[PDB]
From a paper:
Instead, we obtained crystals of TtPth in which the C-terminal three amino acid residues (Arg165-Glu166-Gly167) of a crystallographically-related neighboring TtPth molecule penetrate and interact with the active site cleft (A−C and S2B). Hereafter, we refer to this structure as TtPth⋅tripeptide. The TtPth⋅tripeptide structure showed that the tripeptide, Arg165-Glu166-Gly167, interacts with 7 amino acid residues in the active site cleft (Asn9, Tyr14, His19, Try55, Tyr56, Asn57, and Leu138). In addition, the main chain carbonyl oxygen of Arg165 forms a hydrogen bond with the main chain amide nitrogen of Asn57. In addition, one of the C-terminal carboxyl oxygens of Gly167 forms a hydrogen bond with the side chain amide nitrogen of Asn57. In terms of the crucial regions for the substrate binding, the Cα atom distances of the closest residues between the gate loop (Ala100) and the base loop (Asp85) in TtPth⋅tripeptide and apo TtPth are 9.26 Å and 7.69 Å, respectively. The cleft between the base loop and the gate loop seems to open upon peptide binding.
Pth releases the tRNA from the peptidyl-tRNA, by cleaving the ester bond between the C-terminal end of the peptide and the 2′- or 3′-hydroxyl group of the adenosine at the 3′-end of the tRNA (A76), and makes the free tRNA available for further rounds of protein synthesis. Pth1 adopts an α/β globular structure and functions as a monomeric enzyme, while Pth2 has a structure similar to thioredoxin and acts as a homodimeric enzyme. Here, we present the crystal structure of Thermus thermophilus Pth (TtPth) in complex with adenosine 5′-monophosphate (AMP), a mimic of A76.
Author numbering: 0 to 167
């Protein structure tokens, strides 16, 4: 296996529209065929793997590390796609190593792998007006007025993902 693309999210229909499931939403735009493999939905394409862990958001390392270890996927070929409160909706940024900047899904993968040196695709979702409501904000759906931006973010993310996988 050449690489591993991980979409951050939570399992179950009740989380499917929430901001914290934006990484699953990107993965779901890729055209792939996901199959259940333990606490994970996994797809194989282009010589590599795509993973929607069903571990819960903060526990995704539990699915990522056994897969990476087993197929000897190096951290340079692991990409973690996730929602990011520190960037405004509409903004997308790649990140190579460095701190799991308080993203607990990225943190759980660092913990389980024993390294910070994997890549992340950060998808800005903005912040809530009050910091203490962060969990609430990410476990809410987007506002209907955000949907046009969200769509275009998903389109841009889908291209970024394939670019990272493929040509660049």
């Amino acid at each position: 296996m050449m690489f591993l693309v991980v979409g951050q999210g939570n399992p179950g229909e009740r989380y499917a529209r929430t901001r914290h499931n934006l990484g699953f939403m990107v993965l779901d735009r890729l055209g792939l065929s996901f199959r259940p493999r333990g606490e994970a939905l996994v797809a194989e394409a282009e010589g590599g793997l795509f993973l929607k862990p069903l571990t819960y958001y903060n526990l995704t390392g539990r699915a990522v590390a056994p897969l990476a270890r087993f197929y000897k996927i190096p951290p340079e070929r692991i990409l973690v796609v996730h929602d990011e409160m520190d960037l405004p909706l509409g903004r997308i940024r790649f990140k190579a190593g460095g701190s799991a900047a308080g993203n607990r899904g990225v943190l759980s993968i660092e913990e389980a792998l024993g390294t910070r040196a994997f890549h992340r695709l950060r998808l800005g979702i903005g912040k809530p007006p009050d910091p203490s409501r962060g969990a609430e904000y990410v476990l809410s759906p987007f506002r209907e007025e955000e949907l046009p931006v969200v769509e275009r973010v998903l389109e841009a993310a889908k291209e970024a993902v394939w670019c990272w996988v493929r040509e660049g």
